[PDB]
Amino acid sequence: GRVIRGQRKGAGSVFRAHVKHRKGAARLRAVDFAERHGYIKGIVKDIIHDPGRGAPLAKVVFRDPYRFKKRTELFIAAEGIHTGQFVYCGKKAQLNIGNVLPVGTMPEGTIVCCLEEKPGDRGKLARASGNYATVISHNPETKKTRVKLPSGSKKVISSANRAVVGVVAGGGRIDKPILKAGRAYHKYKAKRNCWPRVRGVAMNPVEHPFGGGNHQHIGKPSTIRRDAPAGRKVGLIAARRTGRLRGT
Template sequence: MGRVIRGQRKGAGSVFKAHVHHRKGAAKLRHIDFAERHGYIKGIVKDIIHDPGRGAPLAKVAFRDPYRFKKRTELFIAAEGIHTGQFIYCGKKAQLNIGNVLPVGTMPEGTIICCVEEKPGDRGKLARASGNYATVISHNPETKKSRVKLPSGSKKVIASANRAVVGVVAGGGRIDKPILKAGRAYHKYKAKRNCWPRVRGVAMNVRTLYLIWSVLRDVKDAVYFIKIIKTIMGIPVEF
């Protein structure tokens, strides 16, 4: 008799809807504009906040709106070492300081970066988890491509115009602290998705008896079935 395995059961039901009602918002880089392409734009870190369901803290950075007389607040993934009141510079001519956003092609080889764009203008897709970072390996001025080493260890060739944040994502060492009790794991995954608790397959003892009964369900002799059960349990029996 067949059984629907765990992976198949997870796909059943309605389409999964992420638990985003209590989250602070999407953490992305600025929309690329004239100021970033040809110079830089200055922002200031207003606050560093916790985002439920995310390991890394977020930074609220206020920029001057280039088209209207007002401020525009962006949510950045906080780099380790930034603080409230710090100025953040975004653009081609920004300095190479922690938290600034520059094109990868303008950074020297060996620079530690995070929140890297996979394609120009996608506002950051790679190396975004807490404590993660990528490393600039080399540049090719002829093809306008750069080679970076990702947190997984794999190396990827991206366009030199792709932007990235200088530094390491804050919140590193999060997985080094033991959870210790089930209550903390419950609250951790409640903010993420329904994937806890996860029972090990080897701990499912009843499954063995169920398999035997499914094989011998047509056997009329119940005594023979009991003898098989005793044999599995290590009790000596005579057939």
């Protein structure tokens, strides 16, 4: 046989991200003395569309505490922030929408977005449009907090991780039918070469496990074991179940 489309995606080539017109990487501030002890003020200059991303991005500007400079930060835009607004990042920032605080100081039930997976990494979790994480509980003795991720999983993270109060803007995006193959063509022309997708049963056996046959049938169980070799791991990968999810 030949290498299947899934295998070919990992080699880069025509399968790399379309990053020509993106505005940069959306991150929190790099943690420094100001955010470790107090807070720093910043002003929202612009809220911009980022190609390939549902959520808008905020362009916040801070004062450099050591030099005569202005620092431009590219934050994830929490819903409700506006241009000209003051945002504050640090340990002693106040619990307002758009402020960046360590999750340790946030009370139980706080809604956050752009939450650091590890302390200092500048924000990794709950960055998709409309999403957020909640704060469940703190363990001051071990300095660790329990949060609920948008997928529903619960995670124990360091209390020192920073995060933005509120939910990511641009929510409810998936509530609109696309209605058109052309509109889906434009959605992915800004992201990557993944569209349109050709079904496995519609290929020949040479380039897919499901291909071939005088009838368009899978011919083998579609739940494939977790340890299947690359080029064989297609279909429902390591599925715990199949069918309609009935109930909770």
